Structure 1
Amino acid sequence: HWRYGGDPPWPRVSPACAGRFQSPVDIRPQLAAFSPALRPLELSGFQLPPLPELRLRNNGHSVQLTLPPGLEMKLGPGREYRALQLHLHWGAAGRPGSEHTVEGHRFPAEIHVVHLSTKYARVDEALGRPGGLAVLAAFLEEGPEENSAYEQLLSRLEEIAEEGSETQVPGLDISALLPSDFSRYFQYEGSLTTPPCAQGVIWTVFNQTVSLSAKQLHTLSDTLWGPGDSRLQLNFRATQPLNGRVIEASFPAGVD
């Protein structure tokens, strides 16, 4: 496979990673285009019952939770999606590791919930098509309290610490891993943030963060191993030039 930071650049092996409209990006809210057509996000089916369980796996680049069929997400008219999986990006002891930044600010970690457009039956058909995939992204920051929803996942990392290992977790309310404010977000068109870096992905970044305790953020960043005998840390791609793309905001943003 490929690696974060290490190895030689990605375009050597995956030339699409040198495309012009890549993710992640630095969001500057005062320069985002206010778009009142961007209405509150709509999710359904995200409150899962305890059974069947969900697969949780350390793939060497992140921890990835496989979602069951039936999770629906709507960005707007004509833009309906089904959720496939969620995974995270983080830093290290101290160091933040979100993928997107806000005015150059990097947050402790970031969650990505990846979705397939209802236009397509299979991910392979949607790759590279405009709108074929959509990601919901939220920043994770340090709060004073244990976050109970995340603890359901974070308490299971120790058992998948080795690269390639997997476990099963009870169904949970996936929407409780996301912010409560569905009305304020940024949206733009970019790419997958790992090879093959396919373009056409609609990114929606919540303005509101989710809060984890310090211990929880330490558990996320320090438990897993990656390729070789290396710790799975700092698993974020550098931000990419906008190259003339306009980031939209669903709310009046970046004032004072």
Structure 2
Amino acid sequence: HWRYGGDPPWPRVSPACAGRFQSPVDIRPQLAAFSPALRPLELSGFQLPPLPELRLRNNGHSVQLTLPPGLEMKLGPGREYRALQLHLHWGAAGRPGSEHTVEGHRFPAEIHVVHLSTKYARVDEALGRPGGLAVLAAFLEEGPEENSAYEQLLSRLEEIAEEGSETQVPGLDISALLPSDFSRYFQYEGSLTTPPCAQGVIWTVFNQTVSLSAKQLHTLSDTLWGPGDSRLQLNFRATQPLNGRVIEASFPAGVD
């Protein structure tokens, strides 16, 4: 096991974290390869009914929501996935904590929805295989008012403040935690951003952000406890070198 912002350096315990094709990465849109074959993402089953409830847990490194069977995500022909869980990465008071960056810019927080390829019946079989797992990532930014979809989760953090504690939340519209623009995104091949840092993961990063109130962002970053009696904050990995990888863009970056 392992921690953010301190020893042991991940390769000392998970050597695969020293791989060449790790995540997250710094995205530079003017250098991304424009790929018009990347069509709008397609989701189905994400609008969940209130029952059954979903497991929400503080695992010491993030807050993780377990997703039920039946959520489908298609990146394109031959690339169909089932969603497994989502979790978040964040900073601290006045300090951003997203995992991916854009031209070196770090955003307040980031959401990851993790999926299993329909080629595989179990996560174990997919680990390390190219395209075995896919993650949808979106940046969380500050907007003027409360995000009602996020409030259904964020209002439940207080009761799972202790590391290892868990609770149950009503079904909600998972797609409402994501951007509304499904057409504009970046895509590349990388790794899990925690040990064991397994490679072969298809990363799709929305260009559009989602807006949370400043109060919500403080709730996310200030409520949970991690290992020891440290606050669960700054739970992101440093960006990793591309090492020749090409990041694709589904849209024309543009001008400015």
Q: TM-score, normalised by structure 1?
A: 1.00
Instruction: Decide which moves more: 104-113 or 245-254.
Output: 245-254
Superposed CA deviations along residues 180-207 of structure 1, whole A, max 9, x for unmatched, are: 0000000000000000000000000000
Quote how far apart the aligned CAs of 1:86 are. Answer: 0.1
Distance 1:58 1:46 in 2: 22
Asked if structure 1 preserves the Cα contact closer than 8 Å seen for 2:67 and 2:84, the reply is yes
Q: Structure 1 residue 167: deviation in Å?
A: 0.1
CA contact (8 A) 1:108 1:141 kept: yes
Q: Shift of the alpha carbon at 1:15?
A: 0.2
RMSD: 0.5
Is there any run of 5+ residues in structure 1 with no aligned partner, and where?
A: none
Q: Which runs of 4+ in 1 moved over 6 A?
A: none
Q: Distance in 2 between matches of 1:59 and 1:213?
A: 25
Matched-pair contact (CA < 8 Å) for 2:2–2:10: yes
Rounded to whole Å, the distance in 2 between the matches of 1:229 and 1:114 is 28
What is the CA distance between 1:230 and its match in structure 2?
0.2
CA positional deviation for 1:254: 4.6
Q: Secondary structure at the match of 2:201?
A: strand
Distance 1:57 1:171 in 2: 15
Per-residue deviation, 1:26 = 0.1
Match of 2:120 in 1: 120
Identity rate, percent = 100
CA separation in 2, counterparts of 1:191 and 1:237?
A: 12
Whether contact under 8 Å (2:2, 2:8) holds in the other structure is no
Q: Could you list the per-position Cα deviations for residues 123-144 of structure 1 after superposition, in whole angstroms to 9, with x for gaps in the alignment?
A: 0000000000000000000000
Deviation for aligned residue 1:5 = 1.3
Is contact 1:31-1:254 (8 Å) kept? no
For residues 196-244 of structure 1, give each alpha carbon's deviation from its aligned partner in whole angstroms, at most 9, with x where no partner exists. 0000000000000000000000000000000000000000000000000
TM superposition shift of 1:7: 1.2
Structure 2: distance between partners of 1:32 and 1:188: 10
DSSP 3-state at the match of 2:43: strand
Asked if structure 2 preserves the Cα contact closer than 8 Å seen for 1:109 and 1:139, the reply is yes
Q: CA deviation at 1:8?
A: 2.5
Mapped to 1, the partners of 2:254 and 2:100 lie a distance apart of 16
Post-superposition shift, 1:255? 2.4
Return 5+ residue gaps in structure 2 as ranges: none
When normalised by structure 2's length, the TM-score is 1.00
Query: What whole-Å deviation, never above 9, does each CA across 1:166-188 have from its counterpart, x for those lacking one?
Result: 00000000000000000000000
Contact 1:28 1:254 in 2 (8 A): no
